[PDB]
Amino acid sequence: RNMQEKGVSEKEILEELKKYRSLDLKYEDGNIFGSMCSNVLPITRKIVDIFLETNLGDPGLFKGTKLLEEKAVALLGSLLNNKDAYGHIVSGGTEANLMALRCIKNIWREKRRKGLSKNEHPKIIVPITAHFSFEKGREMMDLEYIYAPIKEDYTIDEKFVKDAVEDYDVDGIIGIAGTTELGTIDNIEELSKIAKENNIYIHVDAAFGGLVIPFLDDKYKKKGVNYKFDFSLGVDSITIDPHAMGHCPIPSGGILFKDIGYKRYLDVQATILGTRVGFGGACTYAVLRYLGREGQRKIVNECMENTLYLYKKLKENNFKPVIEPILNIVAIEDEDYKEVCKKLRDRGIYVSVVKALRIVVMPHIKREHIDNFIEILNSIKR
Amino acid sequence: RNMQEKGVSEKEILEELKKYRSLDLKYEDGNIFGSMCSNVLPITRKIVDIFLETNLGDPGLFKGTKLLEEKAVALLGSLLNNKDAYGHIVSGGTEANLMALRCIKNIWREKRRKGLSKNEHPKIIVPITAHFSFEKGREMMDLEYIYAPIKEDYTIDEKFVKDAVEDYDVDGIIGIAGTTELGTIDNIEELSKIAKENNIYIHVDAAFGGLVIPFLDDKYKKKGVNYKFDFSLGVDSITIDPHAMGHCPIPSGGILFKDIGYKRYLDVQATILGTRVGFGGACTYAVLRYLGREGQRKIVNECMENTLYLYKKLKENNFKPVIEPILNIVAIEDEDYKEVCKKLRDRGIYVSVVKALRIVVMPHIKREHIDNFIEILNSIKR
Numbered sequence: 001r002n003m004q005e006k007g008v009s010e011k012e013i014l015e016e017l018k019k020y021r022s023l024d025l026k027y028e029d030g031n032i033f034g035s036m037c038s039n040v041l042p043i044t045r046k047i048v049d050i051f052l053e054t055n056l057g058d059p060g061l062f063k064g065t066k067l068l069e070e071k072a073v074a075l076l077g078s079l080l081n082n083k084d085a086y087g088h089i090v091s092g093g094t095e096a097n098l099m100a101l102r103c104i105k106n107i108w109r110e111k112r113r114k115g116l117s118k119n120e121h122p123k124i125i126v127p128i129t130a131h132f133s134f135e136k137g138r139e140m141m142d143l144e145y146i147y148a149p150i151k152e153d154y155t156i157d158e159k160f161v162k163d164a165v166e167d168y169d170v171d172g173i174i175g176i177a178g179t180t181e182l183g184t185i186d187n188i189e190e191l192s193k194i195a196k197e198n199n200i201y202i203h204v205d206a207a208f209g210g211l212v213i214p215f216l217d218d219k220y221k222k223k224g225v226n227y228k229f230d231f232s233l234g235v236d237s238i239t240i241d242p243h244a245m246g247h248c249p250i251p252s253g254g255i256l257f258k259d260i261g262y263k264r265y266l267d268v269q270a271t272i273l274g275t276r277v278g279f280g281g282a283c284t285y286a287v288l289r290y291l292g293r294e295g296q297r298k299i300v301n302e303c304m305e306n307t308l309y310l311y312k313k314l315k316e317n318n319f320k321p322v323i324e325p326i327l328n329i330v331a332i333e334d335e336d337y338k339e340v341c342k343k344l345r346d347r348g349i350y351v352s353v354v355k356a357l358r359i360v361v362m363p364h365i366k367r368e369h370i371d372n373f374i375e376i377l378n379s380i381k382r
Numbered sequence: 383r384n385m386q387e388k389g390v391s392e393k394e395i396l397e398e399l400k401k402y403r404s405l406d407l408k409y410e411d412g413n414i415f416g417s418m419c420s421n422v423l424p425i426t427r428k429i430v431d432i433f434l435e436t437n438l439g440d441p442g443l444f445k446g447t448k449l450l451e452e453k454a455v456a457l458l459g460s461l462l463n464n465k466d467a468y469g470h471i472v473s474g475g476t477e478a479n480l481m482a483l484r485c486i487k488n489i490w491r492e493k494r495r496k497g498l499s500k501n502e503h504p505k506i507i508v509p510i511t512a513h514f515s516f517e518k519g520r521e522m523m524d525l526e527y528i529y530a531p532i533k534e535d536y537t538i539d540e541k542f543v544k545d546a547v548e549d550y551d552v553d554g555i556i557g558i559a560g561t562t563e564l565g566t567i568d569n570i571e572e573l574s575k576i577a578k579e580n581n582i583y584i585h586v587d588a589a590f591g592g593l594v595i596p597f598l599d600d601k602y603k604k605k606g607v608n609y610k611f612d613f614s615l616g617v618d619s620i621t622i623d624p625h626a627m628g629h630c631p632i633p634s635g636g637i638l639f640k641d642i643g644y645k646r647y648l649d650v651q652a653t654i655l656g657t658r659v660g661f662g663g664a665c666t667y668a669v670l671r672y673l674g675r676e677g678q679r680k681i682v683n684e685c686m687e688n689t690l691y692l693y694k695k696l697k698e699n700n701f702k703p704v705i706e707p708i709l710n711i712v713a714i715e716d717e718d719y720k721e722v723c724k725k726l727r728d729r730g731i732y733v734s735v736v737k738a739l740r741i742v743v744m745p746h747i748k749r750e751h752i753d754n755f756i757e758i759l760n761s762i763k764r
């Protein structure tokens with residue numbers, strides 16, 4: 001397509017764009033099974049329109065939108081047991097994780113300048129289940145990762161972390177509250193004890209789980225799983241994303257630090273982006289206020305009901321889930337997962353791909369879609 | 383503000399948000415004089431709504447939105463004289479510049495792995511007029527910058543660059559097509575010759591100027607200024623941002639590489655962000671199609687008419703512009719610029735702050751606002 005001298009009418013360009021949108025899948029149609037995003041809360045469409053022409057890169061021009069970012073951060077902080085959190089509503093969990101990594105690296109830099117570190121690059125303990133944003137950060141910022149192995153329950157091996165912190169000079173620890181692949185929860189309580197006893201920064205990636213775990217009804221909690229992950233454990237920062245299980249429009253990611261003392265280690269404006277949306281903070285604040293805990297609890301446990309329904313139907317049909325679900329994520333063991341995924345795609349079922357098919361039971365996934373999924377999968381298996 | 387158990391009604395939360403929005407400035411009100419963002423083209427509000435629930439981080443689910451990103455990149459490429467450009471509609475000029483820096487660094491890494499570079503970190507020539515995103519990149523990616531001085535016309539000293547490339551092993555050159563502070567245009571033609579003759583990557587930052595320079599009427603072009611900046615000069619990449627002078631909603635930044643061969647140097651998904659908006663590509667494609675060159679020409683040269691009106695009125699009132707404007711940016715020499723800026727702010731005029739006040743004559747700035755500005759400034763000066 002080449003740039004043209006003459007413009008076209010609104011009707012022409014809107015009809016063209018609608019033809020392309022018709023090629024997309026839509027969350028509400030029973031096709032998308034592998035996404036950690038879903039339909040936005042309908043009220044957010046009005047909020048996006050109100051705040052479209054704001055820019056939190058120049059907050060002096062948009063004092064009210066800036067106050068709403070602060071209020072959104074405060075509500076997330078309150079949810080995470082910290083009324084003094086310092087943070088931002090950023091572009092997503094990637095930027096949030098990258099900012100935590102920047103903070104870790106600048107704490108190390110200060111030590112390095114004072115002769116208080118023998119590491120030529122920050123050394124950070126990262127579980128092998130970490131999201132790919134951590135690899136982007138390693139690659140960009142020249143970080144040294146010590147990859148921590150996982151246990152049979154797919155959570156980080158805390159004894160490895162403890163041993164590594166004794167053997168090596170460590171600049172940071174990462175724990176995950178809701179892994180991307182399986183929805184498992186690292187033992188943040190133990191990791192935070194190790195971190196505190198050794199004066200090591202600890203970041204919790206709760207991009208997905210941060211807006212699920214605090215709302216789980218007791219019947220979905222498992223004996224021997226610890227669900228504690230937030231600032232009550234004294235962690236240094238938490239990633240938590242409204243555009244995942246907060247029903248907010250992209251871009252709405254969250255990064256919270258324990259207090260304002262961390263801001264100075266984000267100096268080079270604290271965000272990676274410059275010009276940036278104002279509607280994310282507005283939507284985050286408004287959705288949490290509109291729903292309250294009661295409304296988010298309802299949505300979370302509706303997803304969990306459908307998750308456990310899917311788990312049951314899978315076993316009934318002789319499929320092997322990787323684990324009993326912890327959050328609203330189920331994975332199905334399959335040796336031919338790559339080909340099965342393509343056969344599912346050919347029949348209108350888009351899962352993600354551990355030698356397993358991964359299903360994220362977001363609010364758009366209803367019982368009828370799970371039944372449909374099981375029928376197609378059964379047929380594929382002959 | 384604390385998280386509450388009970389939710390609130392839509393009317394309550396919308397009225398609260400509207401009270402905060404009322405504390406913001408609005409572009410159309412004659413207050414904002416220092417922003418490189420402005421009012422969006424009204425059609426984009428419909429496009430945002432259509433594409434709100436898309437995600438270019440998972441383009442396999444949104445094939446049409448992904449095609450629209452490709453078409454948006456193709457139209458920008460065509461505008462920049464390259465029908466084969468490889469690129470993305472990203473979150474802004476910051477992410478675009480960071481991706482160019484990542485590419486430069488990974489070309490260096492490959493050399494380093496083969497023993498073909500004596501530099502322990504990429505060495506990049508950057509003019510002192512570079513936008514702050516280049517400092518974010520330096521700080522994150524451990525780049526070594528050789529800062530190039532500027533000439534009396536505030537453009538990069540090409541002889542310094544040539545000499546430095548002879549004296550040192552250089553991994554990249556940055557040229558700016560529309561500086562943030564003054565709107566000047568580096569001699570990209572000469573920089574590209576140096577770069578080509580020495581096999582050095584060259585990136586052009588046209589975040590602002592890329593959607594102005596191609597549309598300038600001849601009466602605004604100055605003798606002795608070279609306006610050539612695009613892929614006709616053989617440069618490696620160009621940043622160009624629709625949410626600046628493309629009238630598209632944030633986030634709509636642009637990064638274009640000369641061809642698909644650069645994609646492999648963005649390997650670690652090529653964007654920094656993961657989950658990311660689909661409406662930026664839709665809006666970028668649709669605005670350029672809706673306006674055509676004729677419609678963008680009209681807007682650009684309307685801004686330039688108002689820029690030269692402001693320049694004239696300033697001189698008539700014995701104020702000293704830093705330079706005769708090149709793009710739709712004027713700066714006013716003032717020793718007490720900091721205090722004058724605060725006095726302007728107190729009277730409803732928000733400029734930015736070179737010991738000068740900076741005015742960006744975006745489409746929302748009309749003659750009446752310039753007249754109002756001059757009266758207030760005169761009064762402030764007594």
Ligand SMILES: Cc1ncc(COP(=O)(O)O)c(CN[C@@H](Cc2ccc(O)cc2)C(=O)O)c1O
Nearest residue numbers: 034035036037092093094131180207440656657
């Ligand atoms: C634990 C965790 N941390 C960080 C991130 C990064 O967040 P952003 O994508 O907001 O930057 C993700 C993303 N999780 C999903 C994101 C996603 C969403 C929708 C999709 O259709 C596909 C993928 C994933 O990579 O699987 C995540 O799972």
Ligand SMILES: Cc1ncc(COP(=O)(O)O)c(CN[C@@H](Cc2ccc(O)cc2)C(=O)O)c1O
Nearest residue numbers: 058274275416417418419474475476513562589
């Ligand atoms: C040449 C140049 N390159 C890159 C960027 C970064 O682009 P993003 O801000 O899209 O990441 C800018 C931003 N120029 C403006 C951005 C801006 C816009 C509106 C404002 O109110 C204030 C600032 C500046 O920093 O001045 C720029 O001027």
